[PDB]
Amino acid sequence: SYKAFLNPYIIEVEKRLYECIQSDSETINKAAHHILSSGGKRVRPMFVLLSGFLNDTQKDDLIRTAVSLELVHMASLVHDDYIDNSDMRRGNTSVHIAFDKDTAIRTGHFLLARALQNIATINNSKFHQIFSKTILEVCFGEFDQMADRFNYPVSFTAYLRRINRKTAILIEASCHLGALSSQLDEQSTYHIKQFGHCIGMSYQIIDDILDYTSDEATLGKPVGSDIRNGHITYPLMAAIANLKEQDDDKLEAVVKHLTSTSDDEVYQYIVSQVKQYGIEPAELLSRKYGDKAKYHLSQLQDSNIKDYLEEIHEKMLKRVY
Amino acid sequence: MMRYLHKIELELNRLTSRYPFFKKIAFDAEIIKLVDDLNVDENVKCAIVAIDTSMRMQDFINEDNKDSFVLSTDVLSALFYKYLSQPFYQHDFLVLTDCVSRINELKSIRATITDEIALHNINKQIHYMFIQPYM
Ligand SMILES: [Mg+2]
Ligand SMILES: [Mg+2]
């Protein structure tokens, strides 16, 4: 399976990840270790490695790119958790609670620094153009998301843009950068690139679905956390639209008037309306991106590496397939 | 105002105009004066001012401004990385990214020390972090 072939590399990047976090500073080392210890599926290094294996070539750059992408990913998590007040991280407590605010913000910048250090060896402007551009896009998406809190309506284009920047682009950068550090065929680079984009889009939709459909156990936080923090997502958008087809715009009215001080009763109503009217269309959307990802995988040369990607595509999108 | 200062201010003013949650604080005056006379390219000077302002923003972050300030320090860090990417300034990149991890390390250790001369000195090292390697 994919865990079999990547196993040797996974432990290698994991080893290097711990090397990168070492610090003559006591707290930072502890803090960096704290989040690196947490259960991460290391899905991004996986996409990097597999991207470089699409063509025959061995490079030190490949595995060290995977390391930097993880460090960046984790840097955003530490900052995110503090910003969004998320006190728990998959069973383990988050950095700002286990230490403090100052350590939380320092550790994030520290992880980013080391991540940048790790790839400073790659003398390639295009590589840095892509990576620095995606990091910027992530930031940009965060600004808009923050401004969209409790601001209805949120256009369909703005939503796609939001989930693209917040989840899709980084995964796409994993496939893009992984392909660069192996001089991959351009037509083949386009397909693994678009695959990374589509899989990320699909995954983030599913996650937006689960916020409404799953239990606080699989979520690690209350059901309907997005809307309670002001985030208007496609499931809600789709539910409102369906209700309007039945000549019922009460949900629209409510969401329009929703503010940060709204009552729990209003949220419970929204959540149940979404479960009843907004789930199917969101699943349908997610499936479109899932299918599109399949196409891009099918347009690249038949090989062993193709099968691994195809198997991970099945797992990550289990909720829709 | 130097050429490089117009460049960064133009981009920062464009961000504030576009993203209401981006907060642009004033650049450190002393750091500007020094950077003005640094023997490096326009792009490196922008990166320096970007990352210097980024780290100084850390100290102003509360619960009342975190959904603004945190993200703002993060774009400033990203801009820092952008400025040194095309063309890629390998040496400046190796040096300044080192400064980033080190300044966070110094600030962490600074928290657990009350000694006068020890605090005066570490603060000095922190305040001149990104400009020393060029002097
Ligand atoms: Mg967030
Ligand atoms: Mg979510």
Curated annotation (Swiss-Prot), chain A:
Query: How does the cofactor attach, per the note?
Result: Binds 2 Mg(2+) ions per subunit.
* One GO MF term: magnesium ion binding
The record's keywords, sorted A to Z, are: Magnesium, Menaquinone biosynthesis, Metal-binding, Transferase
What cofactor does this one take? Mg(2+)
- Residues bound to isopentenyl diphosphate are K41, R44, H73, R90
Specify which residues bind Mg(2+) 2 according to the UniProt entry for this protein.
Answer: D80, D84
* Residues the record lists as binding Mg(2+) 1: D80, D84
The EC designation for this entry is: 2.5.1.83
Q: Which GO terms describe its biological process?
A: isoprenoid biosynthetic process; menaquinone biosynthetic process
Sites where the protein binds all-trans-hexaprenyl diphosphate? D80, D84, R89, K166, T167, Q204
Recorded family membership: Belongs to the FPP/GGPP synthase family.
The entry's function note states: Catalyzes the condensation of three molecules of isopentenyl diphosphate with farnesyl diphosphate (FPP) to yield (all-E)-hexaprenyl diphosphate (HexPP; C30), the precursor of the prenyl side chain of menaquinone-6. Large subunit Hexs-B catalyzes the condensation reaction and the final product chain length is cooperatively regulated by both the Hexs-A and Hexs-B subunits using the whole size of the hydrophobic cleft as a ruler.
Subunit organization: Dimer of heterodimer or heterotetramer composed of a small (Hexs-a) and large (Hexs-B) subunit.
Mind telling me what this protein is named? Hexaprenyl-diphosphate synthase large subunit ((2E,6E)-farnesyl-diphosphate specific)
Query: What is the phylogenetic placement of the source species in the record?
Result: Bacteria, Bacillati, Actinomycetota, Actinomycetes, Micrococcales
From Swiss-Prot, chain B:
Reported function: Catalyzes the condensation of three molecules of isopentenyl diphosphate with farnesyl diphosphate (FPP) to yield (all-E)-hexaprenyl diphosphate (HexPP; C30), the precursor of the prenyl side chain of menaquinone-6. Large subunit Hexs-B catalyzes the condensation reaction and the final product chain length is cooperatively regulated by both the Hexs-A and Hexs-B subunits using the whole size of the hydrophobic cleft as a ruler.
EC number of the protein? 2.5.1.83
What top-tier enzyme class does this entry carry?
Answer: transferase
Name of the protein this chain belongs to: Hexaprenyl-diphosphate synthase small subunit ((2E,6E)-farnesyl-diphosphate specific)
Q: Does the keyword Protease apply?
A: no
Q: Which InterPro entries match?
A: HexA
Sequence intervals crossing the membrane? none
Q: How does it assemble?
A: Dimer of heterodimer or heterotetramer composed of a small (Hexs-a) and large (Hexs-B) subunit.
| Matches recorded under Pfam families | HexPS-like
User: What gene is it encoded by?
Assistant: hexs-a
Organism domain of life: Bacteria
GO MF annotation terms: hexaprenyl-diphosphate synthase ((2E,6E)-farnesyl-diphosphate specific) activity; magnesium ion binding; transferase activity, transferring alkyl or aryl (other than methyl) groups
Keywords (A to Z) from UniProt: Menaquinone biosynthesis, Transferase
One GO biological process from the UniProt record?
menaquinone biosynthetic process
Spell out the reaction equation it catalyses.
3 isopentenyl diphosphate + (2E,6E)-farnesyl diphosphate = all-trans-hexaprenyl diphosphate + 3 diphosphate
